């Protein structure tokens, strides 16, 4: 009887649904999300791989959107680096164990569980390199997102309602530590006092811009685009401001 | 006067908005999407890089969603391959030129435009290897998606309304040509006549499944998961069906 088998296999997930603050309408999707290929006791649903595939693109979008909207106004290169750093199996594995996913993971592999235990312990200590990252932990962080998406009738909004609280602190930490965009940094410091002049074309086919910072003087930047020129000029102004005479 | 400069730079985009069947509320976003780093005449908006970043994740999600929902029920490995094949700068560049994006692209690079012309010509002939792919064409296929998203008030639905007609035929072509999932293929052929038995555990810690195809006999599959076992059994049944005695 499939429902009796479901009831057996989902025993203990109550605690997990409370922890993430989401109640599954269809528990089969939650079981599927946590079912590794090796979990032969699950004779009623697919393993997590399809959900992982969907969840990967869902998280890529929600994380990308967040990065793009960040009022730090990261440059394209910084956005790219941040996306690579965050949309990432290791980062996903770290967040999975932070939020106890390993306590609900379904697999038959003593060796995998040993790797998981060591990784959980390391991450706990780290958060109060020769630790192997259990890729399945990253996998189920993704597959659960896919499961919530499916269970909620394909709602990205419901997914992010659940995932944002888990992700935002790490996203914010990474976003706060990457190099600042020199334009936004200057304007944080001198919002009405830093003024960029119109772009001018150079003999060598570049763009030159001057930023004047009232009380500090004028600083020139050149680059292969207006964006790069502004950045260059701001970086110079910032250096003078920091030097403080 | 910024609006006079906008009016000048967007001259000719009328034809493009008609072609994609989307009217921008804010033309600045359309200009930005098509503005390469080298286009120094654009002194009023950013270049396309930020939009490209956002658009990349938007298309990754919409394409992934489509692949996942395809009633061909691709296996995880096939889904992965298809995503890699489709969410791809070369594929994006080919679709951009198919839909005339190169006629509206803003750049200052005779050499780039030469590469573009050769690529347009090749693709036209192909669609009635030693052709360089102009990466900027893939870039603006992505940045325009980001621009439509922004202009429509962050609507994925409006993006896909515009993009689906451009993408679905290529997605469908790739999806139709990849290896079929043997389970779905068998069930297309024998929907009421192919029946999978319950999973059984093997001495070596695998799963074994038999599929019985009425009129043809029984075929066994073994694998490291229930999913793989079913696939294996179906592949055998298919081979017999095709042989047709």
Curated annotation (Swiss-Prot), chains A, B:
Tissue/organ expression: Isoform 1 is expressed in a wide variety of tissues. Isoform 2 is specifically expressed in oocytes during their growth (at protein level).
Underlying gene: Dicer1
RNase III domain: residues covered: 13-153
Organism: Mus musculus (Mouse)
Residue span(s) of domain DRBM: 178-243
Entry similarity comment: Belongs to the helicase family. Dicer subfamily.
Modified sites of kind Phosphoserine: 197
Assembly description: Component of the RISC loading complex (RLC), or micro-RNA (miRNA) loading complex (miRLC), which is composed of DICER1, AGO2 and TARBP2; DICER1 and TARBP2 are required to process precursor miRNAs (pre-miRNAs) to mature miRNAs and then load them onto AGO2. Note that the trimeric RLC/miRLC is also referred to as RISC. Interacts with DHX9, AGO1, PIWIL1 and PRKRA. Interacts with AGO2, TARBP2, EIF6, MOV10 and RPL7A (60S ribosome subunit); they form a large RNA-induced silencing complex (RISC). Interacts with BCDIN3D.
UniProt-annotated site: Important for activity, residues: 135
Protein name: Endoribonuclease Dicer
Binding site for Mg(2+) 2: 52, 139, 142
Purpose of the protein: Double-stranded RNA (dsRNA) endoribonuclease playing a central role in short dsRNA-mediated post-transcriptional gene silencing. Cleaves naturally occurring long dsRNAs and short hairpin pre-microRNAs (miRNA) into fragments of twenty-one to twenty-three nucleotides with 3' overhang of two nucleotides, producing respectively short interfering RNAs (siRNA) and mature microRNAs. SiRNAs and miRNAs serve as guide to direct the RNA-induced silencing complex (RISC) to complementary RNAs to degrade them or prevent their translation.
Subcellular location: Cytoplasm
